[PDB]
Amino acid sequence: KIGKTLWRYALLYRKLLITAVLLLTVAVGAELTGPFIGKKMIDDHILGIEKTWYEAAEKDKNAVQFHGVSYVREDRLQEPVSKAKEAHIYQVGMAFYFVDQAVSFDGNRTVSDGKLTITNGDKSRAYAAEKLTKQELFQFYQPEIKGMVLLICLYGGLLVFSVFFQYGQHYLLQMSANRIIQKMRQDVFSHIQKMPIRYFDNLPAGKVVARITNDTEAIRDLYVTVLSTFVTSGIYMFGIFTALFLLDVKLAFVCLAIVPIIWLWSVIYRRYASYYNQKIRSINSDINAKMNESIQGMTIIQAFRHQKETMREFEELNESHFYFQNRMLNLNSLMSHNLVNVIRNLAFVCLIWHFGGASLNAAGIVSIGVLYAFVDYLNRLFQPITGIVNQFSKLELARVSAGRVFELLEEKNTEEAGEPAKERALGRVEFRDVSFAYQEGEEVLKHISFTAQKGETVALVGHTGSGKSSILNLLFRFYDAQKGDVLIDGKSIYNMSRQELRSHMGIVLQDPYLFSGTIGSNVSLDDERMTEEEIKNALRQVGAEPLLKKLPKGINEPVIEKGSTLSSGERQLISFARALAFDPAILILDEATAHIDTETEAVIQKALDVVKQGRTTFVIAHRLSTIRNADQILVLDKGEIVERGNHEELMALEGQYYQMYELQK
Amino acid sequence: SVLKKLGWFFKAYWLRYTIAIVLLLAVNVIEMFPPKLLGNAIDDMKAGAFTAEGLLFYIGIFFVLTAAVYIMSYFWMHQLFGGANLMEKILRTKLMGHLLTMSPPFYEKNRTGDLMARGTNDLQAVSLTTGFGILTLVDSTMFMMTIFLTMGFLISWKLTFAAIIPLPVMAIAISLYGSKIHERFTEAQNAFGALNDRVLESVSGVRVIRAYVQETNDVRRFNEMTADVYQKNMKVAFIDSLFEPTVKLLVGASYLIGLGYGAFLVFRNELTLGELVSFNVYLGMMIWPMFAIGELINVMQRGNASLDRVNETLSYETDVTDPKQPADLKEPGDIVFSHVSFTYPSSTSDNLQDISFTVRKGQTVGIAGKTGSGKTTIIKQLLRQYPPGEGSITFSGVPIQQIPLDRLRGWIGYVPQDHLLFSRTVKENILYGKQDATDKEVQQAIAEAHFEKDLHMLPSGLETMVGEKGVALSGGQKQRISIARALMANPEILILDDSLSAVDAKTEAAIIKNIRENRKGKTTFILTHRLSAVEHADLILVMDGGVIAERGTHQELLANNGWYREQYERQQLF
């Protein structure tokens, strides 16, 4: 399952993520204690003036000195005093009136002509007032300046705590995400390494590269952005809701009832996004494969003037990719951060509804600080939901990509790989009624049977489709024979390990392949068991290339794929040296000299091959001269060995070999 | 910087974006209301002036505003996302139209995986920045400015000011962070191309990597590459972890300044507790998005680097093999080389030296020589794959340069030495030289290249799906198809270039007979290592190094006692 596999990959790094979430919690603690400080400041400093007054300030925080006497209101007057029930200030419009008289009741603040006007409909002993305004005497809030400055400095201090912990959590999250991606990519490459050749044979090369690189990059984006934002948003929401429940429970309940809303939006987005994104990723893999094929074969795309028809084919994937992308506009325009604002304007409506309903009963004004804190927390709560929804889009895309990737790491047709080789083995090789058929009934080989005897050279010369390369494919276990046996030193190669079997044999494959590096790095394939065997094993058949070269062989660099800057015949001498460089017990030559002039080939290669004749060889040859002295020549016709024997016994027979030999001279 | 490189796109679809900007401005303006409405409602609540009628007014206003903003915001979201999709499409079309018309000299500097990246990945990044990046940038800028003006005019100009002075330093921090992030995204994007062509190299050469047991060294190299990439990304993560906390700290400093100074101001009798809430909602809506505007740079600069890569690919002047030449010849006629001294771009020594051979209107030319001797270096002069050298190649009397590349490639029928087939059917591959043949004409080409018999062996018979790079057929079945590919038409010049290297000494004789009968009067360029394939040639050139040593007909080169005679005796005795 995609979710279970992603979770297990996360569990591979369970300390970094736990530490990151703990650090982020420590940061969010201060980030959200801020507004609680604001509420405390508002409810005790700016609405403290409403308290009672009229003590002589015997001690504590001195007093306000309104007219000629000391005034302290509540907080620093809490020491045992005679507070009485007088000297209450009130606010009406922009005018602050000090009644300075025993106040009976309250509820409706109105002084008009210095009276008490109405008090919840009671009208209890209208009282004389006294206007103050702004500059008359505003030492009334003097005791609160110290508290405000202390709260400001407290939050300023908490900001640095937050900065340190935010750095820590961000760094840990990024490191964990990158480590997870590293592990996933390594696993993908290992699995591709243990894949049958059939998989690589009927699949475009660009499709495998697309799968691995592109889908792992999409999963990387997932882990490094989507999941990091998910964790941060979840912790922030967790903290904000915990704070909200500490202010009002019913309003907090209705505001928290939006989590089911987010779940439902996630489901509705996920359906359509999954379908359209699976289509989009399939089309993108097709695009990558087409790009690879076009670039690889560009030489004869232009020669045969296939550019317009090649542009037509590519534009049909580009147009289809665009079309399936434009089906995202409806979803991504109706379910983007847009809707979050609609929730923002609808969550504030509940705030106003609740607080107004409480106010009509003279209960919603009990704590304006609570309202301030609840507005700040709503703003904070709606800050991260935008990131949540953006990551919701990215998450659907990456879910599709991960589903694509894990369809590769599950494949149960893989092949066990016992890497270790063993000591040198005698070149004895045998076939026993080996019938092999590509794709079921189509048989390419029928009852093949032959044997080498530890030093003999087996020619195996036939016609252009007989199946001479299929024998090599069976011998190298690229393909498993469907009938018969193949044995090396009397043990079935199917009781071996493919690496163990292939360690015995060195092959000059048809269609030579060079790697991007140096020439000496191709003769060696970057193997430490080399020393200076490069020049010695290239001195054979390569004694004119490393001389004209501006660099001395191991420094001059081929380029991508087969060395584009090498002649087709020079790329086959490097493959021949590579095969000889890896000293094999059995040497397979699959038309190793098809692109090499007959002088170089015949003289040099044969002269320096006969000397090392204490070694079994297989020489798939269309040049019958290079196999004239083969100790046993086999004639393959329609996937069947029809004639056997050395050159003399095959010419005396006057058969297919005789015909070909007489024709080639 | 990023926008200017992107200015071509915006002045091409200006209604789709000017209307989006107008709608964005309208939604911002009508979103400036709810905060002030809430402030007024709270102020009314405190003074006991809140009535059910006021409640109805407020809920109705909020419903109308939210509905309007949603309706008229869905439209500009739909414009910007569609514009991003269109940008991706046009960029992909431009890229894949530039990759064609590009000659080998370009392709020997740029790797296939690098180009696949500079397509898929870079275009995805550019599309992401164009839609999401511009969206967020413009929306945030308009929101910030409108909030600033609203707070200044409706609340206070001294409390709005001094609540933004943390932003100047924020601008410098963003500048530094974005400037360093550009330099760490050109390498991050480049390292993706290095991974694409690393996997592509281990997939194409899977047989060689497995034939010699090397699956563990390949995995080790891949692991080392991944470790290097991880270290680079962790340097980037360190920079981002330094950047994010300062963003958050400046946001918190601005919030604290606003809140504390407003609380102080209420005592100076310059603000009402209702106005506080309004101001501290305005500033909150301004600053809280900066928790993500810091991350916006990670999309902007990724898009900038990706577009830089795409623009390096696109601003690659077509190699000196540019047609840029009208001429009225219509018939290749004679082909004369006169002092050709071509030198390959990645070479330091002359690859050809004073080549001075002539080919008449109907003549088979054999080319023999040693390996790496220049046999196919002469052929690639008529293929216009590389810049011309320091001589003349006068098709008839007209230099090869003054001949459009379309007409010349129509003249030439080419059989590459290295097989190049596509993942199509056999008939589809054969129908590459004509593209509009009847099944009768495709059969004639098959018959000429001794492939009629092998069709019976194939399971499908012209519907066999040769497979990727043609690996579903023997090596000599791939070659004969290629011969058919060149024999489907009737090219004035047929270039073979070792077209019988995989054929069983009897298919070779039949194909040579068929080509001799087919090209009796037409011009052919046969390059071979078996000198029995150019016995009929009117002129044989023997190469060595870059210059040609021997020349003449077959009977003339056996009287020279040179390389040709020695080769012939080595090959005619066995």
Ligand SMILES: CCCCCCCC/C=C/CCCCCCCC(=O)O[C@@H](COC(=O)CCCCCCCCCCCCCCC)COP(=O)([O-])OCC[N+](C)(C)C
């Ligand atoms: C999930 C991961 C992330 C989690 C993130 C963490 C979540 C965010 C955490 C935030 C922590 C906030 C800390 C508060 C500090 C500043 C305020 C202060 O001290 O003064 C307050 C003290 O108030 C009182 O004494 C009255 C009772 C109410 C207490 C409210 C704060 C403590 C909440 C319970 C703490 C325990 C619960 C802890 C959580 C379970 C308010 O003062 P006031 O209103 O002026 O009081 C007088 C008002 N009057 C005059 C009208 C009468």
Ligand SMILES: Nc1ncnc2c1ncn2[C@@H]1O[C@H](COP(=O)(O)OP(=O)(O)OP(=O)(O)O)[C@@H](O)[C@H]1O
């Ligand atoms: N693209 C290239 N860039 C640089 N040098 C090249 C390039 N292609 C070939 N060369 C070199 O130029 C010389 C001539 O090569 P060319 O391919 O013409 O020889 P050739 O006779 O066709 O080879 P062969 O007989 O092997 O088929 C050789 O040294 C070869 O390695």
Ligand SMILES: [Mg+2]
């Ligand atoms: Mg073969």
Ligand SMILES: [Mg+2]
């Ligand atoms: Mg050649």
